[PDB]
Design a protein around this ligand. Structure first.
Ligand code: HEM
Ligand SMILES: CSc1ccc2c(c1)N(CC[C@H]1CCCCN1C)c1ccccc1S2
Ligand SMILES: CSc1ccc2c(c1)N(CC[C@H]1CCCCN1C)c1ccccc1S2
Ligand SMILES: [Zn+2]
Ligand SMILES: [Zn+2]
Ligand SMILES: [Zn+2]
Length: 452
């Protein structure tokens, strides 16, 4: 028995209440099943984990150097190419985060830089989005190339702008056209234009990787992910089965920027917004900051386990902000069943994470901003199983530990040194997002006033 069935996230909400948690659609020329609520998402991605970890093919990635051992991680098919890069990135992130604690130090320094760029606005109103973008990009640059960029660096601005444009290309009529029917990529006028900006983004990274190649000291342990990768590539010369090759290096690095920039930055943008709309919550986080850390010392990760309210608030920013509502598509390898219905092999799965984060049977007030969603009456932090902003299963976000570190360190450092407020004489910003692959706060401005 197949599932029933006839911007986007609201239409899927209505379709849920019509046909239920597991329903069918036939978009482009593609069979889709949408999954709603914890139980269907969990059943598909965990219980049937082994047969839902594949990605729908994407013909136009042909343009970006994709091949059987050059698929990067994000859109790579389930198989050894995916699995080798997934293990590499996971363990590289673990290693860089242990011993010397390099990632934590890079994030701590970027938070200091980010506070200074906030101070220099001197209590005049401003949109914080651009600065959040830069801070979070520098964390990726640190992870992947072992450097940061000055916030006024022109190359950095260029890399950022190209990245923003190349996210737009991910959601295009054009893009879906050649993707859905790929034989029109023989026409050079079409092919050259779909991923114009992504190619330029990739060209700018190539330039950075070339520089990094020159300064790499292979006589020392790798100090960042690209070095670790380059070391593996050397061991793999003469092995055509390896995914450690120059064509894949640039896709892996570009996947890490693509997946880890706008998500983390947009989440922080939600957090500041929710802090000026809910100044009472802001002050109570500032209370816990002062009482656990002080107004002087830089926040460290070891603080987080003693700050259940700030942890609650950050979790609630993620749940309410709901920045990846329809997740990232999967594809079924074998046939499976979910909530009774049968799902044939080759079906594109859409995981409706928003329906998990906003399930009315799980959360007390799913459409309000409410830190007590993660607090018990004693004030202990609790994390409900429906907290899945990173999805679940084999393909669940590999950057989650770095994002948790970034959200806590950037968010607490900022509220440690500033008070945020709607600027006098402007409308209360809306708390409704704008969907465009990611859900972002409506554009808003704020005042950052130092606290000492
Ligand atoms: C709040 C911040 C973030 C959120 C909400 C987020 C969310 C997600 C989601 C929903 C997925 C889809 C998982 C699926 O296929 O079901 C994903 C995958 C992924 N994310 Fe994140 N992400 C965040 C930050 C990051 C960071 C900082 C990095 C890199 C350092 C990163 C790298 C990746 C990669 C490489 C994948 C694909 C994993 C795979 O296909 O094996 N993300 N993320
Ligand atoms: C600024 S280019 C950009 C920005 C944000 C995202 C993505 C691309 N990608 C694909 C990553 C791509 C990067 C170029 C090399 C090949 N790989 C696969 C993506 C795909 C599907 C859902 C979400 C996302 S997040
Ligand atoms: C890749 S990660 C990701 C995460 C959420 C969505 C999408 C992709 N897609 C692809 C759905 C796809 C199914 C097969 C036929 C063509 N259609 C678009 C999408 C694209 C544009 C608007 C909304 C959405 S929902
Ligand atoms: Zn390096
Ligand atoms: Zn308790
Ligand atoms: Zn200060």
């Amino acid at each position: 028995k197949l599932p029933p069935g006839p911007n986007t996230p609201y239409c899927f909400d209505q379709l849920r209440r019509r046909f239920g948690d597991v329903f069918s659609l036939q978009l482009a020329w593609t069979p889709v099943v949408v999954l709603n609520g914890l139980a269907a998402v969990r059943e598909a991605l965990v219980t049937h984990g082994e047969d839902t970890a594949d990605r729908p093919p994407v013909p136009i990635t042909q343009i970006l150097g994709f091949g059987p051992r050059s698929q990067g991680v994000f859109l790579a098919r389930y198989g050894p190419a995916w699995r080798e890069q997934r293990r590499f990135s996971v363990s590289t992130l673990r290693n860089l985060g242990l011993g010397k604690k390099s990632l934590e130090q890079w994030v701590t320094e970027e938070a200091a830089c980010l506070c200074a760029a906030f101070a220099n606005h001197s209590g005049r109103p401003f949109r914080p989005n651009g600065l959040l973008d830069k801070a979070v990009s520098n964390v990726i640059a640190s992870l992947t190339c072992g450097r940061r960029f000055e916030y006024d660096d022109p190359r950095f601005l260029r890399l950022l702008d190209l990245a923003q444009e190349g996210l737009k290309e991910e959601s295009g009529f054009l893009r879906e056209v050649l993707n859905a029917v790929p034989v029109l990529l023989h026409i050079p006028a079409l092919a050259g234009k779909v991923l114009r900006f992504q190619k330029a983004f990739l060209t700018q990274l190539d330039e950075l990787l070339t520089e990094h190649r020159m300064t790499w000291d292979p006589a020392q342990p790798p100090r960042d992910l690209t070095e670790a990768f380059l070391a593996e590539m050397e061991k793999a010369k003469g092995n055509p089965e390896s995914s450690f090759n120059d064509e894949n290096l640039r896709i892996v690095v570009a996947d890490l920027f693509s997946a880890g920039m706008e998500t983390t930055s947009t989440t922080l943008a939600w957090g500041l917004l929710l802090m000026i709309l809910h100044p009472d919550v802001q002050r109570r986080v500032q209370q816990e900051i002062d009482d656990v850390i002080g107004q002087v010392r830089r926040p460290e990760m070891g603080d987080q386990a003693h700050m259940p309210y700030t942890t609650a608030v950050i979790h609630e920013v993620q749940r309410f902000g709901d920045i990846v509502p329809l997740g990232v598509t999967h594809m079924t390898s074998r046939d499976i069943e979910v909530q009774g219905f049968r799902i044939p092999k080759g079906t594109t799965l859409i995981t409706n994470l928003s329906s998990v984060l906003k399930d009315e049977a799980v959360w007390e007030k799913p459409f309000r901003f409410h830190p007590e969603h993660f607090l018990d009456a004693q004030g202990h932090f609790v994390k409900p199983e429906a907290f899945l902003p990173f999805s679940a299963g084999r393909r669940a976000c590999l950057g989650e530990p770095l994002a948790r570190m970034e959200l806590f360190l950037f968010f607490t450092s900022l509220l440690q040194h500033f008070s945020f407020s709607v600027p006098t004489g402007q409308p209360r910003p809306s708390h409704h997002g704008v969907f465009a692959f990611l859900v972002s706060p409506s554009p808003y401005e704020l005042c950052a006033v130092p606290r000492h």
